[model samples]
Target: SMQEEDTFRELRIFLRNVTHRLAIDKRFRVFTKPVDPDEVPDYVTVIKQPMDLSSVISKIDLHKYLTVKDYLRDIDLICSNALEYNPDRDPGDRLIRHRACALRDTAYAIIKEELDEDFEQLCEEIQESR
Candidate 1:
């Protein structure tokens, strides 16, 4: 069906554009790669589910995401994990927390810019059908 095809194509395009925009930001560099377990011994323990931008891209390439919500959830996880691991008491943690918050806001803004009422409606339909 044209509707199904168009929805799939538009979602992929939106994901690509959003990923590109995020990857280009200097602040987002810290989140581009996976966290080193050796560097942060307790990271894996504290953050049960770790997520990064590169992983999101990998998932995109693998066609692992079924909907925009699934993609956005991963994006949210990346930021939330950072915020959770790095508390505000320490200066370094504070910086990371701030960056994560900013990154999340930027991602949301980009999503708003790229999505319209039609696309959102399509997403809803897709979700309902699943």
Candidate 2:
């Protein structure tokens, strides 16, 4: 509640990063809003425009950030441990396995959604690897 109103700050950040793809468009006349009029960055040029947010969707795609390899690495360790899992000896082992399965499921779901190509084969390979 004590925070200052930082509305322009938020909008500036949103607009700057949001339309960064304008850096790709060679023609300055293409942009409707013309971001970087002064070319503040001096590295690139652009204008503000009504950008297709969908295009930004591909740019901001979160799947690559998930990095399923790390999840699979942990899942592999979990699977290896599951081989010797003893519910009676280790009461929480099942819970650990559950968490690993959840991570693997989430990782696979993201990979499937973001990378639709060869999804089945990739899953099969991951399964075999696991």
Candidate 3:
């Protein structure tokens, strides 16, 4: 029980760090808040489950993520939704899609650099403690 709690606490910290890293990146500014439906009317219709960096931060503050994977899933959703809605039919849409891909790549790179091995080690320790 204590181990589980510790793991969640670490996950929350990790999420906060990751989100802050993403938020400070100039390229990711567009994804810091929800896509305005008024600005892009079709966004809501195409992406039913929209996500953004600000929402992720709120979730972290609320302790909604139980594990690192859950937090990562939200980041993935933000990128995928952009890719899905923006497509690559035109230069403008393609640019958005490229940005989405860049975000995805950056997110994964941060996770790998900051958490991947350490998280796995923590999980292993938890399993042993259990």
Two-way lDDT contest, 1 vs 2, winner = 1
Top-TM-score structure, candidate number: 1
How do the residues 34-89 of candidate 2 rate in per-residue lDDT, one tens digit apiece?
23436435213321222322333343343211223433453344333433332444
Computed on alpha carbons, the lDDT of every model, listed in order, comes to 0.84, 0.37, 0.83
Off by over 4 Å in 2: 1-90, 118-130
Which of 1 and 2 is the better model by TM-score?
A: 1
Better of 2 and 3 by TM-score: 3
Q: Output the lDDT of residue 24, model 1.
A: 85
lDDT of 1 by residue, 1-130 (tens): 6777677777877788798889889988899999898998899899999999889988987777657778889989998899889876999999888888888899888877777868777776886786
Q: What TM-score does each of the candidates earn?
A: 0.89, 0.28, 0.84
lDDT tens per residue, model 3, 15-128: 898899889988888899998878988888888999999999999989887666677789889988988887669998888788888888998888888787767567556656
Could you give the candidate ranking by TM-score, starting with the highest?
A: 1, 3, 2
The 10 consecutive residues of candidate 2 with the worst lDDT sum are 43-52
Ranking of candidates on lDDT, top first: 1, 3, 2
